[PDB]
Amino acid sequence: TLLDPLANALSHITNSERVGKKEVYLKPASKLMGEVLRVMQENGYIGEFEFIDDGRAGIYRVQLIGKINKAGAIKPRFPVKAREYEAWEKRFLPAFEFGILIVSTSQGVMTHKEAIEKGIGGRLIAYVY
Amino acid sequence: YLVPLDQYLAAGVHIGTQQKTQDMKKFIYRVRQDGLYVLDVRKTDERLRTAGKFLAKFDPTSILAVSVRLYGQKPVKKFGEVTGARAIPGRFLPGTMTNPQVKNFIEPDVLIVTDPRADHQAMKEAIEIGIPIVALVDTENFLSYVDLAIPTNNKGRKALALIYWILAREILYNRKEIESREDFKVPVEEFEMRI
Amino acid sequence: KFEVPVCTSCGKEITPREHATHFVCPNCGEAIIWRCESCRVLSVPYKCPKCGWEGP
Amino acid sequence: LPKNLIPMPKSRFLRVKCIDCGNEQIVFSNPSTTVRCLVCGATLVEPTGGKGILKAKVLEVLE
Amino acid sequence: DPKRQRKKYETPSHPWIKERLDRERVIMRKYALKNKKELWRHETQLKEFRRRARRLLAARGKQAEVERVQLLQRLNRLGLLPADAVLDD
Amino acid sequence: SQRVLEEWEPRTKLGQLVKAGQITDIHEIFRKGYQIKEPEIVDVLLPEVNMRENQEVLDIALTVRMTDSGRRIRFRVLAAVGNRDGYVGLGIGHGREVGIAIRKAINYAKMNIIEIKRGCGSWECRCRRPHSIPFAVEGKEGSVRVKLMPGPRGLGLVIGDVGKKILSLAGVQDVWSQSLGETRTTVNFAKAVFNALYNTNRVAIQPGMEEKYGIVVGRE
Amino acid sequence: MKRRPRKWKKKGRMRWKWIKKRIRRLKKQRRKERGLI
Amino acid sequence: MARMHARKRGKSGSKRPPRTAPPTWVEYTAEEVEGLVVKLRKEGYSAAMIGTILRDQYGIPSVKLITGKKITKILEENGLAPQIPEDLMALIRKAVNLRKHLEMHPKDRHSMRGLQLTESKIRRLVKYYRRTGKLPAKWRYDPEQAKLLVR
RNA sequence: GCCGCUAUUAUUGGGCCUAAAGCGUCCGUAGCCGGGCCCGUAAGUCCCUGGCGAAAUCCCACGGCUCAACCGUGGGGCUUGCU
RNA sequence: GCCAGUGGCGAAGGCGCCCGGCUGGAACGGGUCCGACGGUGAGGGACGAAGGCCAGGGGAGCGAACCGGAUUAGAUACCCGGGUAGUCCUGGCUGUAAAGGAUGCGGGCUAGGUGUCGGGCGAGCUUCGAGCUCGCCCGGUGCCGAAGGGAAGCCGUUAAGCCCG
Ligand SMILES: [Mg+2]
Numbered sequence A: 001t002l003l004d005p006l007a008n009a010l011s012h013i014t015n016s017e018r019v020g021k022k023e024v025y026l027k028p029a030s031k032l033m034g035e036v037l038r039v040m041q042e043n044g045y046i047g048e049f050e051f052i053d054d055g056r057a058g059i060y061r062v063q064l065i066g067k068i069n070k071a072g073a074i075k076p077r078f079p080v081k082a083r084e085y086e087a088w089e090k091r092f093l094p095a096f097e098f099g100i101l102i103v104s105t106s107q108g109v110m111t112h113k114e115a116i117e118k119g120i121g122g123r124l125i126a127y128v129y
Numbered sequence B: 001y002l003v004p005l006d007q008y009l010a011a012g013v014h015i016g017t018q019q020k021t022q023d024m025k026k027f028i029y030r031v032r033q034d035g036l037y038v039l040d041v042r043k044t045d046e047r048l049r050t051a052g053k054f055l056a057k058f059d060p061t062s063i064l065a066v067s068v069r070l071y072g073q074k075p076v077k078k079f080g081e082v083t084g085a086r087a088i089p090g091r092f093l094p095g096t097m098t099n100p101q102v103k104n105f106i107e108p109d110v111l112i113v114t115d116p117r118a119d120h121q122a123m124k125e126a127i128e129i130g131i132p133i134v135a136l137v138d139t140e141n142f143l144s145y146v147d148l149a150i151p152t153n154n155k156g157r158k159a160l161a162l163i164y165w166i167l168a169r170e171i172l173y174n175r176k177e178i179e180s181r182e183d184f185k186v187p188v189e190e191f192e193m194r195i
Numbered sequence C: 001k002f003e004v005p006v007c008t009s010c011g012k013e014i015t016p017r018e019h020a021t022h023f024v025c026p027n028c029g030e031a032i033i034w035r036c037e038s039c040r041v042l043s044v045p046y047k048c049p050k051c052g053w054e055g056p
Numbered sequence D: 001l002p003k004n005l006i007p008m009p010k011s012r013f014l015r016v017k018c019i020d021c022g023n024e025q026i027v028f029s030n031p032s033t034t035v036r037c038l039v040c041g042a043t044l045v046e047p048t049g050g051k052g053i054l055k056a057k058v059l060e061v062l063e
Numbered sequence E: 001d002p003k004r005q006r007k008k009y010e011t012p013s014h015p016w017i018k019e020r021l022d023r024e025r026v027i028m029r030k031y032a033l034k035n036k037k038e039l040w041r042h043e044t045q046l047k048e049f050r051r052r053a054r055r056l057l058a059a060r061g062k063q064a065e066v067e068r069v070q071l072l073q074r075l076n077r078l079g080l081l082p083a084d085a086v087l088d089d
Numbered sequence F: 001s002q003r004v005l006e007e008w009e010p011r012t013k014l015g016q017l018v019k020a021g022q023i024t025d026i027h028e029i030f031r032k033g034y035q036i037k038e039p040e041i042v043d044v045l046l047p048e049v050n051m052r053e054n055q056e057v058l059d060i061a062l063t064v065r066m067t068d069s070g071r072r073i074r075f076r077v078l079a080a081v082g083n084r085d086g087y088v089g090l091g092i093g094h095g096r097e098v099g100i101a102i103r104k105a106i107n108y109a110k111m112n113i114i115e116i117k118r119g120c121g122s123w124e125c126r127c128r129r130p131h132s133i134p135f136a137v138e139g140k141e142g143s144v145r146v147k148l149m150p151g152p153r154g155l156g157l158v159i160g161d162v163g164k165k166i167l168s169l170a171g172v173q174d175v176w177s178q179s180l181g182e183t184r185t186t187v188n189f190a191k192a193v194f195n196a197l198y199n200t201n202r203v204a205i206q207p208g209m210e211e212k213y214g215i216v217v218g219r220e
Numbered sequence G: 001m002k003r004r005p006r007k008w009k010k011k012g013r014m015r016w017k018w019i020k021k022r023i024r025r026l027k028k029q030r031r032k033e034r035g036l037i
Numbered sequence H: 001m002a003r004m005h006a007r008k009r010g011k012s013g014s015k016r017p018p019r020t021a022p023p024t025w026v027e028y029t030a031e032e033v034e035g036l037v038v039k040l041r042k043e044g045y046s047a048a049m050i051g052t053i054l055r056d057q058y059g060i061p062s063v064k065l066i067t068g069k070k071i072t073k074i075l076e077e078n079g080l081a082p083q084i085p086e087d088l089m090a091l092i093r094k095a096v097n098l099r100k101h102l103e104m105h106p107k108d109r110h111s112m113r114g115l116q117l118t119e120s121k122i123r124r125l126v127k128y129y130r131r132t133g134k135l136p137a138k139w140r141y142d143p144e145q146a147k148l149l150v151r
Numbered sequence I: 001g002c003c004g005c006u007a008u009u010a011u012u013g014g015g016c017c018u019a020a021a022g023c024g025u026c027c028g029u030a031g032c033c034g035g036g037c038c039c040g041u042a043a044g045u046c047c048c049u050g051g052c053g054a055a056a057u058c059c060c061a062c063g064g065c066u067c068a069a070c071c072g073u074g075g076g077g078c079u080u081g082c083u
Numbered sequence J: 001g002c003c004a005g006u007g008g009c010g011a012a013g014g015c016g017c018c019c020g021g022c023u024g025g026a027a028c029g030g031g032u033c034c035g036a037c038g039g040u041g042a043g044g045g046a047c048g049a050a051g052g053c054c055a056g057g058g059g060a061g062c063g064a065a066c067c068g069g070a071u072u073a074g075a076u077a078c079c080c081g082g083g084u085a086g087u088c089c090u091g092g093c094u095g096u097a098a099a100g101g102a103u104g105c106g107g108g109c110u111a112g113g114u115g116u117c118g119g120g121c122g123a124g125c126u127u128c129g130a131g132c133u134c135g136c137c138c139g140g141u142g143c144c145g146a147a148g149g150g151a152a153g154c155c156g157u158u159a160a161g162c163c164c165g
């Protein structure tokens, strides 16, 4: 059944970007979907996201800007020390600082770059390039 | 607000078809109890104005207008004789745009197809060139590879004559090949087939 | 160097041998609408950046 | 944005009055039970597969 | 399960590539070499330098900085690079 | 080039412009939907393509048609041309004789010319100069699934001979590959490599990545 | 039996129904000469 | 929601609108709403039927919106909530009636399958309600004990 | 003979209409996967630090046998890790 | 039987004269209740076409085996005439099939068009009919189809596409 709203959201973004849609709606919203979108906005992959509120888990309206090739969840949320991001980059991204691996840490949800400059690891949950 | 409303409706421009398309429901005004959809003449008028400006900014001889349909074969011809606009009423003759080894090889800069489903040939050759496509579209037409659309019955002798007459007038107006539009002389009856 | 054009709909950097098209805004002029093959064949509406004329 | 965003009811609650007592009473348009007037026992809406058939609403409102 | 001294030259993956053969024939005549073995020995020297440089590009400090410095000063000492040189070089 | 330009009468709108001195750069040729039906256009704007070197024949196959009265043989020729900066094209040509097929294949190649992005995107060069591609890229044709990866400088082209040839004509000096399918199908292998090199353009980027990866769209 | 559609084809084969029947006759003989005679 | 043994993607259901506050057209307060709930349970209606009647007759949408509480919460407060939960009870009554049918009709294997699926649902809910305490841990479905239960 | 070639064992990273391959169909036990919010714990997880994971072997520099191989000095790594 | 259909129901196998009784499941409508109770399922269980077997009945037509007539070089067959088991019922066993959508099940996303079944809504018409026509929603079942996918055939919101198991 439903499992990982985050993966579903990312796949939706990916498919909508392939077909040139300007806005997507992510229906089983989460604080994690929101943090991931915060990061994607900050690194300039999407435009503007707003939380719509129903009586249910809430929706996210997400305005895109044509800067995504592949966005996806690393679903075995892989533990990663502060000195293995090289390898996980090589697995998930095409060039050396091209995209963004999103990492959940004890100090929040971050990019692997910020994690590196903080010297903290965590768990990988998504990639975006 | 050109050609007020009853001339349009007498031509049958608002009249669509029993079939629809979501690409065109933007223009569909309503559906009536027989199953026939109806287009918005206000949108028709707007898009005609814009098409006039556009094709006026274009060069005359670079314009090509095709119509496999006979009801459009004549008014396309008159559109050409009025504007200098490379009419092709008959069959498109595959290779007109792509094969430089045909007799009449034409590399235009814009295209004014009268129905995309009937002019599928000219459409794909224009696609290959990379030129804009202005198209008359009825409720059952898809907007694929159409960069400007004008809603119309696009199957009526009348309404085809009238749409092409309006376009010619607006093109000349925007070129200043005429002053105020009433200085146009040609009649819709000249644009029409009259059987 | 030279600049690469970009669709007004998808914003996705038109490619060399793409069945794309370009043309000035009707109802505005003064603006080159670029339109990619995907957008054309999928009837993706555009919108002039200067004006707001939408178009197919 | 339309018709699936925030799925909203098509049904309505609507105020009716019986023909016999004349007491205004709120009801539901798509009832699963025969609705009876709280005072007279009169059927105000008879149930169907969908929108109930309304008796006794000659002065009506809908919210 | 012990050491087992290994060769310090690498042989090519295919022995009969016309391009490689021509190139190596020219080098061997120019530099008067007895052996492809000798040539490949120097090629392997180069390869190891390159691999170290690669790793140290894709490496992090406090060590892999030492080795950066060591690589560059070794190559300076050998006369392959100037003192103002880099891993790019 | 003046030499072909004299003999050449254009027959096309694009050729008229080129002859007329307009559209003086192949970059002005490309990203416009235009229709190239003239190797003379390509030779004028890219004269190094006329050269026997910078031309590469990649496959010759004798294909058969049966008839009453036996076998009628045709020759399919897969050829590539290119300026060893960033322009390459690939063509197939058919003939009853190999030479006809070759000249036809080369014409179609010049017509199928494309423009590619070059750079450096490997974790272990970061030289900001266009010896490789700037980001991993994928291409396909038939069963063949070619995945090109940026490599460091001096690596060479870690790919089959077909890719070596095409990438050399396109100006890529260093690359890693992973392939699937039947690479012993030269046509589809070549087209897969070619399509990967075009997908270099299909991929999107952010502003500073141009500078950091050394991205170059044609000549440098 | 486990069967194989591949075997059901006939390009260079005998029919599988009849191959099967032969196999079963053999098996019956073997079973017969094994347990009681 | 034929899902669970039929795998049809049925979507029939209710569409509650997002409501942070109760509607202003509503007449009744929380207290008299509770009184109506209790009245109807004494009339012998299940909680589902109570909500249905309060929706259709009294024009009460979402007793939860009004009172802040649920119908079964109100019932257990007034000492009227059912011993075993209603959905389980309903399934058990179905199963018992079907047991009877199937004893007089042994060859109705399709209805026998319906019984099997019904008892599967029973077992699922029993597992969940044991885990949540709404039943004792030692509770277990049995046809004859369930017959005594219904009766 | 082993590895590679072999994405012909596929975690990375394979396939199952017609090529090898979806149990005849369903039900369900273990197992695995599991909606959203709040609070807590801090078991996994991450960081820092103490103690260990012999030497040889591996990488690097520097020195001694003509250079090298070899040997030594030092830096690092390795040991599945455990604490 | 005709009606009877790219029709319907069913997990599949499969299910067609009418009437009554018992009974299963689904869709729709639902500001009803419960409140994550869910998915998949090793092992395990239930159902499971025809045929066959045990026992007991029945036995019209058809009819393996067999028996005859032809055919043919031959004809252990195809054709013809008969005919046993069997086909039907009861209770059991068997548990196999091109048991096939040759496509495991669940969930989310990625243009649609046109039919048809069922329910609902809104309009119009009506012989005022559980009627007809149009449109919309949901769910089924089909054809076509751009993009996309694929070795291709072909699939293509009932994926053989992307993702989560
Ligand atoms: Mg094998």
Ligand SMILES: [Mg+2]
Pocket (backbone or CB within 6 Å): I014, I015
């Ligand atoms: Mg395989």
Ligand SMILES: [Mg+2]
Pocket (backbone or CB within 6 Å): G005
């Ligand atoms: Mg098979």
Ligand SMILES: [Mg+2]
Pocket (backbone or CB within 6 Å): none
């Ligand atoms: Mg040691």
Ligand SMILES: [Mg+2]
Pocket (backbone or CB within 6 Å): none
């Ligand atoms: Mg098709």
Ligand SMILES: [Zn+2]
Pocket (backbone or CB within 6 Å): A020, C007, C008, C009, C010, C011, C012, C035, C036, C038, C039, C044
């Ligand atoms: Zn676009």
Ligand SMILES: [Zn+2]
Pocket (backbone or CB within 6 Å): C025, C026, C027, C028, C029, C030, C031, C048, C049, C050, C051, C052, C053
């Ligand atoms: Zn404009």
Ligand SMILES: [Zn+2]
Pocket (backbone or CB within 6 Å): D017, D018, D019, D020, D021, D022, D023, D037, D038, D039, D040, D041, D042
């Ligand atoms: Zn009353």
